[PDB]
Amino acid sequence: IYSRSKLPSEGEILIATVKQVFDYGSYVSLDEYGGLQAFLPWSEVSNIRDVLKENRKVIVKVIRVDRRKGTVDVSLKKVTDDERRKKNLQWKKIQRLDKILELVSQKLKLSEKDAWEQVAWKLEAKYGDPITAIEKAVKEGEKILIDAGVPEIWVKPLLEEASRKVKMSGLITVRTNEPLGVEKIKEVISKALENIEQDYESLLNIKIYTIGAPRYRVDVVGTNPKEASEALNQIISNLIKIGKEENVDISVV
Amino acid sequence: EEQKIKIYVTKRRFGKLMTIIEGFDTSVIDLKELAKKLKDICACGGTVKDNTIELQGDHRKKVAEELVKMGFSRDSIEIR
Amino acid sequence: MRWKWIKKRIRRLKRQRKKERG
Amino acid sequence: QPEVNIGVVGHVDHGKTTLVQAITGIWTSKHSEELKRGMTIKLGYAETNIGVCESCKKPEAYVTEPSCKSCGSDDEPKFLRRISFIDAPGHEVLMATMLSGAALMDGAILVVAANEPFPQPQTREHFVALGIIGVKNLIIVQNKVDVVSKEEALSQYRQIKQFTKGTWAENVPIIPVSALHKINIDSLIEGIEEYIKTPYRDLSQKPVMLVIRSFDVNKPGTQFNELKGGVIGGSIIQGLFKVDQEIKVLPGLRVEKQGKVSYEPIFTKISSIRFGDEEFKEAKPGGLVAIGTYLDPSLTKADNLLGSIITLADAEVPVLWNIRIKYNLLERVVGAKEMLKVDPIRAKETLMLSVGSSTTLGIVTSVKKDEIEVELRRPVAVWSNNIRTVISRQIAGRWRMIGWGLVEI
Amino acid sequence: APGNVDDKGELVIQGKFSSQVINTLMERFLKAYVECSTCKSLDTILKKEKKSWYIVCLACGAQTPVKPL
RNA sequence: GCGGGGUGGAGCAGCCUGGUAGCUCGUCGGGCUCAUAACCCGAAGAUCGUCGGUUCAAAUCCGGCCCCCGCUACCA
Ligand SMILES: Nc1nc2c(ncn2[C@@H]2O[C@H](COP(=O)(O)OP(=O)(O)NP(=O)(O)O)[C@@H](O)[C@H]2O)c(=O)[nH]1
Ligand SMILES: [Mg+2]
């Protein structure tokens, strides 16, 4: 994912990948900046073996850009979790794209640098995430491509070459006094956790458990961050309702 | 068990010198209610100040004796 | 004043009437 | 399932739990981590099998596992019964639970410490509680003789043989032990195989039982698909429960309406029956059981329905708020280091009324010769007319056993 | 090393080992499977159940759980 | 085995961003008030756990032990 800049603007947030775990930090590579290797120290981290992994692609904020030597430091603490989702959808977009040029260029036998220079940098102009100036393109026409002046070589090879976990959880409370209460719990949970796999669709796994005696935890894990509470809330809603429509009291913390 | 306490004189307003009580486990002991009870024993004003109780005037012995009455270990209490 | 007294009288009454009721 | 309920009363740290450990093997955990630095805090629990070496000599003949080849020889010792214990605590303040616990006992064993001044506060407090409630099948035990002079343990046996005099305790034998090196325990098994006989219980009677624990089995994290039911721990006394019966809990949960109070009975189905770690289809007196239920485990987490009782659904039992006690006092307060003489009851006084397993607080409305009328915070389900009770007063901050009587309806 | 026992209770170790090392390994055997943890008596039994063996002191009465092997 | 912490008498800052040790419990001096408090200013006190290392300079950065505290939350 070639960049139209040398160094990321400091304080910026982006997707990078852990390259090399050393003792006093590790080297990462900012996937949005031609894999621009940078430096990440423990004073910015925090079971640490699954995010300090060899290749899992983390997200971070740029603590320091020394434009001089050409080195960069980042942190993953300093990443708001309100940033951590938005810039987590932006990811799945920016990688649909990657794939596209990663196969068109190849097909066209050229360069992903000339696939990113040409296709993606001028479709930067026409206000937009280029993958959407192509989602209008493939639907509408190749004249959305030619407008911005996208070298009419990729155009068609583009169009035709056109057509993973996140965890979210919640503390609930489920009281009951019914003679066969446990049972009704199992029920309302298995009726409020129903057809959800298709409603707020394809996610990965959902887990409901007791961590207090009335306090519980629901756990939606998925592929698209902003599919999170979408699923989750809905579930938690239908808890209440069906809980509230089957004599079992339920209430979010 | 194991709850120690310190009772000593603490500068205050009109009168002479307040009384400070510290060392209670605030997760188990409600200082608001303790203070209210102590204020009745001393018949003085007082407040919970952070994790301590401050009483107006010198009531060190009064407070210590009342705390023992309330079930707190005699040996956990020191008057300074 | 009569605020005072009314609630003092009431509290006396209640507390004592609590002690009579009990 | 265990036949009988033997209690292990006594002063603090004399080793009650330890003696239970030499007999069964079991510890009471000492848990909540607190108990692990402190001592027994909930009633401990443990069971064991007593067989006998017919084919050899006693007391050693008194075995613990189907194995005689430990003394004399092989012939697989004959099984006499399986018993259960109830380890109380010993601390002057856990009085309110130990009381509670007695309600399940069919007999007891008084663990005195061989290396500390015989009538120690709680030792007595307990003893008289025992002679008061009715637990007349008693065995005194001289524990820490593994740390004393061969003179000392005999002279204590004297002070004991002399206390055990005027009192109701004729030939309540006294078996010195070493709970630490498990020495002489087999003669203890022979005592408890003689004197603590297993009482008959008419089953036909109304199914009635006392509760003293209850847990949320469910592990931190078990999914909802297999949330195992609410679980009620306690002891049966009269009747017998069976898997799949319809049951209720009394007085049961109270509601809240703007400062009001209102208890009411909980119904459920006996999901399951277990003694020790092994499951049974039915359950009969003597022992503690645990009852798997179908009710929201919230309802019985920490030990909520403590002091509650379980009976036949659609059964006739009073949930009183106000009660008629007939009654008597001790002349002394055997339980303070000080023996100060018991002041007679003044009305409008708060007293702990220990009824059955439950522990409730209440205020005195009536003061006659031996019939007072009490008003209670939490209701008492009075299952019989024969309801023994135990009465206490906050003497010096800590509560103290002062007298008794009989519930009256 | 391999070996079995005489019909007359003798141990024949199919290997010529130094008298010493035998003891060293033997005491280690005592430590882990015979000696009581509580008091060190050596006057013990050795229970066995599904998968848990225990040392059982005839003096102190305690049970040192040992790795069934 | 991990990781947090030893700073005037007590209880807490300051340390990854090396040169300035800050805050509350009473003391002492001077103000304000007719006077007491309160409030204000000025004063007493710290080998910063120890044995050394790097540096111009170490409370501060790197290692060596000595006590102090916690570790992924407990069982019919
Ligand atoms: N030397 C010796 N020590 C013993 C003996 N019995 C118990 N102890 C010791 O006494 C201590 C107290 O054990 P514990 O059983 O908790 O006492 P307890 O009386 O059960 N506590 P609680 O009164 O609360 O139930 C243990 O540390 C044990 O080592 C004995 O016969 N000899
Ligand atoms: Mg104990």
mmCIF file with all atom_site columns, C-alpha atoms in Angstrom, chain A residues 5 21 26 29 32 41 74 95 127 146 170 174 180 182-184 188 198 203 232 243 252:
data_model
loop_
_atom_site.group_PDB
_atom_site.id
_atom_site.type_symbol
_atom_site.label_atom_id
_atom_site.label_alt_id
_atom_site.label_comp_id
_atom_site.label_asym_id
_atom_site.label_entity_id
_atom_site.label_seq_id
_atom_site.pdbx_PDB_ins_code
_atom_site.Cartn_x
_atom_site.Cartn_y
_atom_site.Cartn_z
_atom_site.occupancy
_atom_site.B_iso_or_equiv
_atom_site.pdbx_formal_charge
_atom_site.auth_seq_id
_atom_site.auth_comp_id
_atom_site.auth_asym_id
_atom_site.auth_atom_id
_atom_site.pdbx_PDB_model_num
ATOM 1  C CA . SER A 1 5   ? 4.038   10.767  1.617   1.00 0.00 ? 5   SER A CA 1
ATOM 2  C CA . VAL A 1 21  ? 9.990   -8.839  18.498  1.00 0.00 ? 21  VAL A CA 1
ATOM 3  C CA . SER A 1 26  ? 9.869   -4.209  18.467  1.00 0.00 ? 26  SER A CA 1
ATOM 4  C CA . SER A 1 29  ? 5.851   -1.727  9.576   1.00 0.00 ? 29  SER A CA 1
ATOM 5  C CA . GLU A 1 32  ? -0.052  2.369   4.660   1.00 0.00 ? 32  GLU A CA 1
ATOM 6  C CA . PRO A 1 41  ? 8.586   0.386   22.903  1.00 0.00 ? 41  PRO A CA 1
ATOM 7  C CA . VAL A 1 74  ? 4.315   4.576   17.507  1.00 0.00 ? 74  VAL A CA 1
ATOM 8  C CA . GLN A 1 95  ? -7.557  -3.816  1.550   1.00 0.00 ? 95  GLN A CA 1
ATOM 9  C CA . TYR A 1 127 ? -13.344 13.188  -3.421  1.00 0.00 ? 127 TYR A CA 1
ATOM 10 C CA . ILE A 1 146 ? -11.902 8.428   -17.003 1.00 0.00 ? 146 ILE A CA 1
ATOM 11 C CA . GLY A 1 170 ? -21.577 -6.427  28.082  1.00 0.00 ? 170 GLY A CA 1
ATOM 12 C CA . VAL A 1 174 ? -30.801 -11.478 35.001  1.00 0.00 ? 174 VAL A CA 1
ATOM 13 C CA . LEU A 1 180 ? -38.189 -23.381 37.001  1.00 0.00 ? 180 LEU A CA 1
ATOM 14 C CA . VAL A 1 182 ? -32.698 -21.607 35.302  1.00 0.00 ? 182 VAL A CA 1
ATOM 15 C CA . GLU A 1 183 ? -34.746 -23.122 32.541  1.00 0.00 ? 183 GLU A CA 1
ATOM 16 C CA . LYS A 1 184 ? -36.459 -19.887 31.600  1.00 0.00 ? 184 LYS A CA 1
ATOM 17 C CA . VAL A 1 188 ? -34.997 -16.246 26.988  1.00 0.00 ? 188 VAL A CA 1
ATOM 18 C CA . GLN A 1 198 ? -28.399 -13.683 9.791   1.00 0.00 ? 198 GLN A CA 1
ATOM 19 C CA . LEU A 1 203 ? -19.811 -12.486 12.508  1.00 0.00 ? 203 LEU A CA 1
ATOM 20 C CA . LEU A 1 232 ? -24.657 -7.091  20.492  1.00 0.00 ? 232 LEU A CA 1
ATOM 21 C CA . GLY A 1 243 ? -36.960 -11.668 29.370  1.00 0.00 ? 243 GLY A CA 1
ATOM 22 C CA . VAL A 1 252 ? -27.970 -3.817  31.321  1.00 0.00 ? 252 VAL A CA 1
#
